[PDB]
Amino acid sequence: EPCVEVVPNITYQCMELNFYKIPDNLPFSTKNLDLSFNPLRHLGSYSFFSFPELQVLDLSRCEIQTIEDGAYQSLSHLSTLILTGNPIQSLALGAFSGLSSLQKLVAVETNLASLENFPIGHLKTLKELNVAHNLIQSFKLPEYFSNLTNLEHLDLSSNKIQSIYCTDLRVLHQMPLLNLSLDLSLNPMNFIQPGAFKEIRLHKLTLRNNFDSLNVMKTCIQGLAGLEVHRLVLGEFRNEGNLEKFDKSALEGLCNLTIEEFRLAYLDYYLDDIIDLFNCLTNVSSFSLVSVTIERVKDFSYNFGWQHLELVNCKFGQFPTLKLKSLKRLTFTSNKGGNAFSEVDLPSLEFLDLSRNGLSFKGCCSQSDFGTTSLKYLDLSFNGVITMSSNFLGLEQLEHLDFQHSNLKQMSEFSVFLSLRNLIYLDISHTHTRVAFNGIFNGLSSLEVLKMAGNSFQENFLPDIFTELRNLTFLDLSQCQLEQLSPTAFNSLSSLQVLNMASNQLKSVPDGIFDRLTSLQKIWLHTNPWDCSCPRIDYLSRWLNKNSQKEQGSAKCSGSGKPVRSIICP
Numbered sequence: 001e002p003c004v005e006v007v008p009n010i011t012y013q014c015m016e017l018n019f020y021k022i023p024d025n026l027p028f029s030t031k032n033l034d035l036s037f038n039p040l041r042h043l044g045s046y047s048f049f050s051f052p053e054l055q056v057l058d059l060s061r062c063e064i065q066t067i068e069d070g071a072y073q074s075l076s077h078l079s080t081l082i083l084t085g086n087p088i089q090s091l092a093l094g095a096f097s098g099l100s101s102l103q104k105l106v107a108v109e110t111n112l113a114s115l116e117n118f119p120i121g122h123l124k125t126l127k128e129l130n131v132a133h134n135l136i137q138s139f140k141l142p143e144y145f146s147n148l149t150n151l152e153h154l155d156l157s158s159n160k161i162q163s164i165y166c167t168d169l170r171v172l173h174q175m176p177l178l179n180l181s182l183d184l185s186l187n188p189m190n191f192i193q194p195g196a197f198k199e200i201r202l203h204k205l206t207l208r209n210n211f212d213s214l215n216v217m218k219t220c221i222q223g224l225a226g227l228e229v230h231r232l233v234l235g236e237f238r239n240e241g242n243l244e245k246f247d248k249s250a251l252e253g254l255c256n257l258t259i260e261e262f263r264l265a266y267l268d269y270y271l272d273d274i275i276d277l278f279n280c281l282t283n284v285s286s287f288s289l290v291s292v293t294i295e296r297v298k299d300f301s302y303n304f305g306w307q308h309l310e311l312v313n314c315k316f317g318q319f320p321t322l323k324l325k326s327l328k329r330l331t332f333t334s335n336k337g338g339n340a341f342s343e344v345d346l347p348s349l350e351f352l353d354l355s356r357n358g359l360s361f362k363g364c365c366s367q368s369d370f371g372t373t374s375l376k377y378l379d380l381s382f383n384g385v386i387t388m389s390s391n392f393l394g395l396e397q398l399e400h401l402d403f404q405h406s407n408l409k410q411m412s413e414f415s416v417f418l419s420l421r422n423l424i425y426l427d428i429s430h431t432h433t434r435v436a437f438n439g440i441f442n443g444l445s446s447l448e449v450l451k452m453a454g455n456s457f458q459e460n461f462l463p464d465i466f467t468e469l470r471n472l473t474f475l476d477l478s479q480c481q482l483e484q485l486s487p488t489a490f491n492s493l494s495s496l497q498v499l500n501m502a503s504n505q506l507k508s509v510p511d512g513i514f515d516r517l518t519s520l521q522k523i524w525l526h527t528n529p530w531d532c533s534c535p536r537i538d539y540l541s542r543w544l545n546k547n548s549q550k551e552q553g554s555a556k557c558s559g560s561g562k563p564v565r566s567i568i569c570p
């Protein structure tokens with residue numbers, strides 16, 4: 001069969017097969033058909049009579065110039081239609097006749113010059129329309145949109161809109177039941193007429209790479225006046241040379257909008273102000289700063305009423321002091337600069353993600369660090385040296401804890417989680433941890449996920465350090481340089497479904513070491529130099545054999561490389 005078969009009687013990827021005609025040899029039950037990159041040229045009446053069940057139809061880049069009325073006539077169960085990259089020069093009035101289910105239409109780069117003559121007014125079930133990268137130069141919304149009641153996403157990015165006039169959204173105004181996300185990214189925009197957005201509300205507005213000047217952006221923002229939006233996103237990724245100044249007053253126009261959530265993604269711009277720059281955002285529930293440089297200023301510590309604060313991929317010069325009474329979720333991630341955590345006062349913080357910053361933590365972890373007792377989630381992975389001093393005092397409600405790839409100090413010779421009786425997920429992988437003290441994990445009676453890959457053990461021996469972890473479901477001991485296991489090590493792990501022991505130096509295991517893993521569903525034992533010289537291997541070869549469905553990858557013996565599951569000992 002020329003057509004690649006992905007899922008029988010369901011999916012087919014007839015990609016680039018020089019099809020001049022729709023393949024008739026295919027089944028009738030096919031729900032997903034990809035005909036992308038085939039010279040179809042013209043889609044005639046009932047082009048798809050042979051596909052009753054079709055739900056997804058990809059006609060990407062099939063040099064289609066004409067689509068006749070009823071080309072998709074019988075496609076009553078089609079939901080997504082991809083036309084992307086077809087040089088359409090003739091669309092009949094009824095080219096989309098029969099598409100009584102269509103929820104998504106992608107018509108990127110279809111030489112579309114305007115929405116006015118686009119014959120889609122009758123597709124009531126349409127939820128998504130993507131017309132990015134066409135020649136559309138008008139923001140005027142066609143009168144048929146009034147029939148497009150379920151439309152939730154309009155993609156107008158990469159077109160030719162330079163001006164938005166007061167008269168452009170009259171039809172949208174008469175639709176006070178619509179929930180529309182609009183993206184106008186990459187339109188050459190210079191003017192938005194004041195008042196055009198009064199009494200308008202959108203779920204989301206994206207404006208990225210739209211303005212040639214931080215004086216033209218301002219003019220366009222003043223024409224946004226009256227707009228009530230759930231999520232405003234302002235992006236600019238085109239800065240080349242030095243870091244560019246983001247004028248402190250460039251945002252004072254945002255006071256005359258209603259925004260619930262705000263993101264500013266201004267690549268290599270730098271802020272020399274905070275308080276007045278972000279004044280018009282004081283009451284936003286979700287604030288977001290991405291890719292910006294914040295050196296001169298270092299204190300968001302005001303009374304901003306933000307509940308969610310996201311600071312990602314920025315340059316800081318120093319870890320900023322934050323003091324916010326209403327912040328519940330903080331995301332401080334993938335930033336560079338000032339490699340040192342500094343105490344914050346964030347009462348009512350429930351979620352704290354501080355991963356991937358290279359930060360050092362000289363004392364950790366307690367309430368006096370964070371200003372909260374409500375912490376449920378704490379992620380300190382991919383940072384520098386974390387020195388433990390406090391056993392999570394004021395933070396006993398923790399349910400998720402992640403330290404992976406951070407250098408942890410004063411943890412292994414202690415019982416630092418003794419108070420964490422609600423902890424469900426703990427990851428200490430690659431934390432320079434060297435196990436000795438059998439008490440390392442005491443107190444973790446409700447723990448289910450324990451990741452400790454890439455560490456090591458005193459004498460490469462795994463002692464009975466999982467005794468009180470009766471709720472354990474997932475355990476990763478991969479890459480731990482293990483040479484010997486304790487025979488009673490997994491005795492309590494009655495609920496363990498996943499055991500990963502791959503990439504160790506295990507030659508053998510104690511007989512009956514899995515006897516009590518009655519819940520075990522998946523096991524990794526590969527990349528270990530197993531020794532298949534009977535009776536030594538008998539227990540393991542026997543166990544892997546009858547439990548073969550459970551084994552992930554392939555355990556093999558040193559030398560022969562024969563699968564350990566394949567060995568039969570006398």
Ligand SMILES: *[C@@H]1O[C@H](CO[C@H]2O[C@@H](C)[C@@H](O)[C@@H](O)[C@@H]2O)[C@@H](O[C@@H]2O[C@H](CO)[C@@H](O)[C@H](O)[C@H]2NC(C)=O)[C@H](O)[C@H]1NC(C)=O
Pocket residue numbers: 255279280281282283
């Ligand atoms: C941050 O919010 C406060 C209070 O929140 C009120 O905002 C009102 C405009 C309205 O949505 C109301 O329902 C909501 O409770 C704002 O205080 C308002 O300030 C204006 C002048 O700026 C006064 O005229 C209002 O009386 C006052 N609100 C009320 C009704 O007490 C505040 O302006 C706002 N600040 C920023 C930076 O946006």
Ligand SMILES: *[C@@H]1O[C@H](CO)[C@@H](O[C@@H]2O[C@H](CO)[C@@H](O)[C@H](O)[C@H]2NC(C)=O)[C@H](O)[C@H]1NC(C)=O
Pocket residue numbers: 445446471
């Ligand atoms: C071990 O896991 C069990 C089972 O999932 C947990 O039992 C739950 O306890 C909480 C706290 O009271 C209840 O809200 C749940 O309804 C219980 N689960 C059910 C449906 O049985 C237990 O908390 C965990 N830790 C232990 C036993 O200390």
